[PDB]
Amino acid sequence: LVGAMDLTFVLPLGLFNPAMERFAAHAGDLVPAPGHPEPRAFPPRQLFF
Amino acid sequence: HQPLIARDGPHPVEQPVHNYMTKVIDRRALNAAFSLATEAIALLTGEALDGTGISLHRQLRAIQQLARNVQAVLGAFERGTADQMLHVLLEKAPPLALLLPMQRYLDNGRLATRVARATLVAELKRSFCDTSFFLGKAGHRREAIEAWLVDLTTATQPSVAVPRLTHADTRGRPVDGVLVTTAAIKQRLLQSFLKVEDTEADVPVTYGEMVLNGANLVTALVMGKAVRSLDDVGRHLLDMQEEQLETTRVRADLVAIGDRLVFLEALERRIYAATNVPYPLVGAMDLTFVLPLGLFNPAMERFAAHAGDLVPAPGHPEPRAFPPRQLFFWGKDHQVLRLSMENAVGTVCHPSLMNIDAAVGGVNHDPVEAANPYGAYVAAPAGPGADMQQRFLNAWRQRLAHGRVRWVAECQMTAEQFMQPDNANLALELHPAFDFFAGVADVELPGGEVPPAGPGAIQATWRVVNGNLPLALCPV
Amino acid sequence: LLPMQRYLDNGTRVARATLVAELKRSFCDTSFFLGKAGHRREAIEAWLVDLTTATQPSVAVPRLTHADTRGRPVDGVLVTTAAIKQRLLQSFLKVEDTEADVPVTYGEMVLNGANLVTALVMGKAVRSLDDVGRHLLDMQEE
Amino acid sequence: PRYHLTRQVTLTDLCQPNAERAGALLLALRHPTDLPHLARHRAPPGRQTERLAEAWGQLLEASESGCARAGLVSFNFLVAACAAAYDARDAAEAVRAHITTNYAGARLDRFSECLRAMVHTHVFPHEVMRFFGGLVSWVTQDELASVTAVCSGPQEATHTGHPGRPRSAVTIPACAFVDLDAELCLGGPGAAFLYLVFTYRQCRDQELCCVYVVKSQLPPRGLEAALERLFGRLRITTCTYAAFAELGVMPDDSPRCLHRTERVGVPVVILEGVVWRPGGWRACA
Amino acid sequence: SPVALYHQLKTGLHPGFGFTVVRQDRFVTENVLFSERASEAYFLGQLQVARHETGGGVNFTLTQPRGNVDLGVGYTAVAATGTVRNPVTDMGNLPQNFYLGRGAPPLLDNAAAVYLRNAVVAGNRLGPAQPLPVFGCAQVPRRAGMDHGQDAVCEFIATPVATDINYFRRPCNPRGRAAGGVYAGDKEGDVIALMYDHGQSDPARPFAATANPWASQRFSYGDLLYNGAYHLNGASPVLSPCFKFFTAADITAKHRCLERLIVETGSAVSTATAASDVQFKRPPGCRELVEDPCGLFQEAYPITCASDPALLRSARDGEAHARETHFTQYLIYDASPLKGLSL
Amino acid sequence: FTAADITAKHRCLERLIVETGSAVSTATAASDVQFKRPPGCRELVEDPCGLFQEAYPITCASDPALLRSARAHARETHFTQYLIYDASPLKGLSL
Amino acid sequence: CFEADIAIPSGISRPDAAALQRCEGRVVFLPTIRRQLALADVAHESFVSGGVSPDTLGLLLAYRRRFPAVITRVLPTRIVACPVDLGLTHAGTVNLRNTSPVDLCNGDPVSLVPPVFEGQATDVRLESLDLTLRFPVPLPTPLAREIVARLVARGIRDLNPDPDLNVLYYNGARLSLVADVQQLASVNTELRSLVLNMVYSITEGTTLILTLIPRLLALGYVNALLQMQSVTREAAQLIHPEAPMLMRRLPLYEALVAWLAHAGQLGDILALAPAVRVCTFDGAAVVQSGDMAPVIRYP
Amino acid sequence: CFEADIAIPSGISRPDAAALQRCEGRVVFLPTIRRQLALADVAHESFVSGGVSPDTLGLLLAYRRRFPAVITRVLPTRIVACPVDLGLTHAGTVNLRNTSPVDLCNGDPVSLVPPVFEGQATDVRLESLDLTLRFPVPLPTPLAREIVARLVARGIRDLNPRTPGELPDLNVLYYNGARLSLVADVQQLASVNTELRSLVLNMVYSITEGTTLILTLIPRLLALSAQDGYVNALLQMQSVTREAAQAPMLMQDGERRLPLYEALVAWLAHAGQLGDILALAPAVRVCTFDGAAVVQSGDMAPVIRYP
Amino acid sequence: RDPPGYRYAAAILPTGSILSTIEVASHRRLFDFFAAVRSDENSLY
């Protein structure tokens, strides 16, 4: 009765948001120091879990 | 005779009625059948037998099969009366939160002032939208469900009859309520709410199902079979034993709500086990849902709710101020969906948009006179070109100032054109591709210099563009 | 099971799809249900009564009188991987009615009489043919 | 419920069931007072549309509406009526000898002129004179004939074939060796279908008639395969020759016969066991 | 022109006018019944064993004619409808197609007749078969596999863009005007001009004549598409939810007595059938007993839909911090009997 | 992705769930990196993905900044980044 | 006979009780053969299929679909009607009610559509329950097939106007077909459904073979036998149509299937198959209009 | 009924006896009217003419002069059948087994079609005596006439193969949806030619002297499809009539000859009844006593006589 | 092909009555021999 269970998981790499959902949740979040490139506009190439 | 209250006051002595109520019977058939094969007709009748023990035993299966069909289909009427009663209760069952405002209106006298008709309805629609689905919506809230059963029970009037045979108690109280529930709710409902005295002390043996239907049905087909008559006639002594497959009291469930002792019992496990008839107290509800697509926000309501949020990256143009062509909502899951007017190409691009031949001939009954037809008439060009404006200001000078011309209804704003005042031209706005307007009846579109005063006729023109539908219906 | 048993009562191609769309929503939500929601007590009393009522009690065998516990008969098993059984009772259902039951011993089924001939002279050896043959010879003579 | 009866009061100018037998394929005479009007239509105007008005007017002269509309042309009456028409002599003069002695041959000569004239103005004798039955009794007076002549399919010859063997019962005589074209020469054992076939040919032998019966274990929908064959009369060039209505079923293949016993020596066929499945006409090309 | 509208909508330019979207869903609900002591008397009759013979042996039939009666001076036996098992519908996104209906007078230009017809129906779920057959139906060709359930069909009514959003978020009509005979006032000249006069005021919106000028007026393309008499659909099998509204004869003479009207609500007949794959209008042999509150009050409830997804995440789990509007993007929160529930 | 696996499955929902009690896994527990099953091995895994033919998301995101709020109140999307909240029977669980 | 009992609805007016009494012997089309049947299922409102009350095309589809039934005995709260198509051949004699032609000793009547005569004739309308019974017209097959081709011819002269077709003299009858005053405006508008089929399937039938035979006989035994029959009969009108009109295999072969099914439906819709037969006994055999005739089952 | 016994000849294999157990309610083509018959005269070896077996057109040609009967009872030595063309005189209402992908209706006329779909093979095998029994496919008469018109024009494509090798299918049938695939294998010449001749013959007799008066109204229809919805669906898109417009000629013999009235009946008699000359005649009508409005694919339907 | 039918003289004396009553086609794919009569048949005798 102790038994296993198999699952398959789906994760997206590198995809891109639709046209409506490229907003920021507020104007003044997640900004770096004022000489730095704001890399949040870059298309993602990574994933974190 | 209805309950009356002796009334005071300077009123006319109100009209006294003491009559006999007439009612309408229904006839219901409750049909039932059973097959009988090509065997058991040559058998059971002596028609195909012998002295062999097996030919005597081929009969007995077909003897027992009539022990098993007739006990079923005569059982089926008892299984069918409870099916019929749940319908003819639900045939006259007005759904609750359409009776809680209804009886409190009739726990007034009743008010034929037509305002209290209207204050009924606009509150009748409100109590429904609030508590239709009350358990599950307010299922975890104890003492609101306690308040819900006491409104479920007491709101009905006990109908004026004495059934002469009282369902008893095991302690003291006569039983009046029924409270039929499904099986999935009764599990949730018995576990919280006591549940006293679990035995019906009486359910008397009056003539209620029958005593002779077990004898009449086997006998009416006996002379019909006419040689399988004494087959089933000698069977019924030995029928009940072999088919067993080797005033009074009935165990039923009792609860008390407030002070009302009801027979809270679920069916569908007793009379509907594997009969493939749906339980009648599961009942589909048809709603309709308005999801207005593509509309535009009113004038004072275009705020942000805070100065910076929903902000794009600075290289991007901030879309959200474009008029919203899309509509997003959850489905039969999480499931965000999308309406998005490109999906509406199957409605308006169909070439039934351009049919108003049912309209302009139809709307033309009771015609208005041709009132100040400035923008409606086209003259033919005549004379030299040099002064064609000039005699137009010489000739037309009366009727051009006789009234306000229609196509400046411009000063009407949003929610000014939608209302009755200053908008007799509301009922001349009918089609999105067409400007209906009054014009002359028998005069052609070209010709002439001054239109002959004739009886006016409401006519159509095709809207060439989308920009020229009016500004109160398409703001700046 | 719990949606799939529910449609087996009073049960339609849409009823196939509205089954399957509603099957996976329960399994995504009510599974691992002692780990999930195991802190609160109400959802597990609802969970045990979902086990004990989902099945169908079907076959009447009084040949084993497994009725135990001063007269109130047993009707379940619940083999439950004892690390869970320590956690089930001590918070949720510590209702140990007794600690003793009444089982039985084996009943045996041997080719005693006529079944030794019918297995050998014929092929078929229908069970309890000493009693079934007695019941078949009691019906036709009246 | 395998039993039916008919009864109709008609005149003795036609069939005269006294001189006829107990077995007689009584056809009707559908609509005598008709055809000045439909004889005018259903044809080109170069067909001399007053011809059925005159030739049947001579036939009614050969003997007003009366208390009995003119019905019951026998199957006996038609054999002499096309006796000069089909290519068979000395087997056709015997049935005409049965009529001019036992039935007036002036009623034959006026009728055969109608048979040419019916196909002349394109109003055929089929869709006229539907099948009526088998003549159980003839209670006939001097002028009338109130014949019980049961319609309605299989039982009509079995109710006149079960008690047939004793004395003389129906036996259903085909009444000619030239008629009853018994088909399936290339044939084996099976229950056959009876039909009632009228063949035609426009202006070959001047709108010819042939009245006879075929017997086949072929369907009425497959009979047109055989009816298009077996004829040289496929050379009209308008159309609609070889009409047929199903007389029904002969479920005893051995029971066809050849005899010469009637009344005058009339060659004849015993037909033992008949289903009178009444059917309908079928004429297109 | 409806060729120029084809190029705007598929590409994405807004054509200067908006849409209201009506959609009929079907929820299977539990019930709880009550009754009083003697709610209904009941008659019995006799049994009349009636025989019949088929291929094989004999077949007996038994039927007992019997009677009920009301027996109630007042209301008895309410039916409180409180739990929901499942929505049968998917709750959206099937566009209503008028090419299934053949009552429309088509274009003259026969190049434009068949170019407009196939460019729409390249792949519609509601697309007909090869042509419309004159006898039969176009069958609305079945997909091989289906997941959520019976597809509810979205019907579209043209509206101006300058209607107040405050008209919605509220159980209002789609036709911009209250219309039902429950609202009527017993003149006997009432619901001809309650529904189609525009000097008088809307009942539901007493401060305006009608909130929607196209749908409300007689002969006016909210009328012409969807009235029961004109039948641009009616040869087409697809359920029209706006036939519940917009219909002349049903809102007319049918019934008036409000005290009688509520016992005939929970027993009512659905326009749809749930057994059909895509919901069809009701075949002649079918009876689905449906509560259907919208047939009485002549209304339709809005469910939550907002034109951004950015607003749509915010109106989860409460309307406390619901981003109700933002520059042009509007949010509607659910106003329905299904408010406060899971689905 | 395999037509022969799907087509060989019977369609009756009476029996499809009882092999969703015990179905044969294509993976063994023994080897270090999970190996495709050596052919004589009956593992009897529970296998819910084989019935619905559907698979699951777990909590993943492209920023760690989005990911830190994944412990509802999650920063769910941002300029070009994205997050996926858990949708699995492992939601509401630790390990 | 397996006489299926049609249930009267609940209480009607006293003239509605007497009106259904004189329908004893009319023709009733029941959709299914349940021994219990309602009367709304019988009524003409149950023939509403496409959201409209049907024309004679839509009636002939429905009449070629459901099952005929003669009303045997009219009872209080019940109609006892034995259907035709159940039973073996020539069993169960029962009475029809005659309508204006004679219905002789045989003739195989056809229960054909009511608008072949005056429009609101025989439309028994119960004022109480507010339904409509349009009983059909029992005419014999050669009189059936003649008239149903006679009325579709008349609509062509009205479809595009400039001898009176409607004479049709019978054995004793001068059949007044023309109800000129108000019915020919209403009978012509109801064959609008049936005419446009009859025009099309001819014009789709002729023009298919007018472009088939030039494209065939050009690539065996088809050429030998077909031209053997059409020697200067169809070839005379082949040069006549190709000159006094206008003149692609793949549009043609896709149009070969489409006509043949549509032309095949008119063989079942029109041509009026004999439902029942008249075969009398102890009777005068020439039936007056409005007189009962013994009528038995199979052709 | 005239119950016809079909002798089951020799031995029988234990699945071969069960082969007959599942055929109660199928249709036997028997080429006679017998009270006694052997089984090999029924089987598909008896369908085989001189040298070859017939193709899907010749099977109908074999079925035309071969009488249908329905299995009523199943015995191991006899198969009691009832000949529909004769013995349908029943108050017993002999049943029929639907063997098709098609729900019929309650009341539709039903005719028989050979197995012509991709998965409806239905050819049973008997290992004791090597016989094949292709059972026919009972189908509604609008569906069957929509089948037979496909095979004929495909056989005419087998006459002359002008255009390049991209032809439309005539392999696709639609019935309430349901893209059905036919079996397009081989087209025998004589089975085409006998079916080709009758179609060309019947359409010539459909043109009479008054027929060309109807040909005058061709621009009358094209005005109506421009302003009526019933006409627009009636003149279909792939119609030759719409291509045809890309003529009274009085000539009146006698001037009173009813010129339309002969052109209608002759068209009704000749090209109207094309379903009786290409396919079998309808004789099967679905009559459900208990109130079933449909008959599912694989279900039983009680059957009464001619439509 | 099939198991040797059902035996109808067996279970005229049934050794046990089934303690639960369901629709039987809900486990149709379970059984080996199966026959669903309509209230009588010819093979019962």
Numbering used by the authors:
A (entry chain E): 394 to 442
B (entry chain F): 100 to 345, 360 to 589
C (entry chain E): 198 to 208, 212 to 342
D (entry chain K): 106 to 168, 176 to 215, 220 to 353, 416 to 441, 445 to 466
E (entry chain F): 1032 to 1374
F (entry chain E): 1277 to 1347, 1351 to 1374
G (entry chain I): 5 to 166, 174 to 230, 235 to 262, 267 to 318
H (entry chain J): 5 to 165, 168 to 252, 258 to 318
In the authors' words:
When five-fold symmetry was imposed, the resolution of local reconstructions for the portal vertex in B-, C- and virion-capsids was improved to 4.05, 4.50 and 5.36 Å, respectively, albeit that the portal was five-fold averaged. Apart from the lack of the CVSC, PVAT and genome in the B-capsid and conformational differences on the portal as well as PVAT, the structures of the three capsids are indistinguishable. Strikingly, the portal in the B-capsid situates inwards by ~30 Å. It exposes itself by lacking the PVAT and forms a basin at the portal vertex, suggesting a ready-state for docking of terminase complexes and genome packaging, when compared to those in the C- or virion-capsids. Lying on the portal head, a novel five-fold symmetrical assembly comprising five copies of a well-resolved two-helix coiled coil (presumably being the fragment from the portal or pUL36) shows close contacts with PV-Ta.
Here we show asymmetric reconstructions of herpes simplex virus 2 (HSV-2) B- (containing scaffold proteins inside, putative capsid assembly intermediate), C- (DNA-filled capsid, derived from the enveloped virion by using detergent treatment to remove viral membrane proteins and outer tegument proteins) and virion-capsids (enveloped intact virion) at 8.1, 9.0 and 10.2 Å respectively. The asymmetric reconstructions reveal a unique portal vertex in the context of the icosahedral capsid, including 1 portal, 11 pentons, 3 types of hexons (P, peripentonal; E, edge; C, center) with the hexameric rings formed by VP26s, 320 triplexes (Ta-Tf) and 12 pentagram-shaped capsid vertex specific component (CVSC) densities (composed of a UL17 monomer, a UL25 dimer and a UL36 dimer, presence in C- and virion-capsids). Radially colored representations of the three reconstructions reveal the dodecameric portal situated beneath one of the pentameric vertices; but, the density surrounding the portal displays a five-fold symmetrical assembly, highlighting the symmetry-mismatch structural features. The portal vertex of the capsid is a hub for protein-protein interactions that are important for capsid assembly and genome packaging.
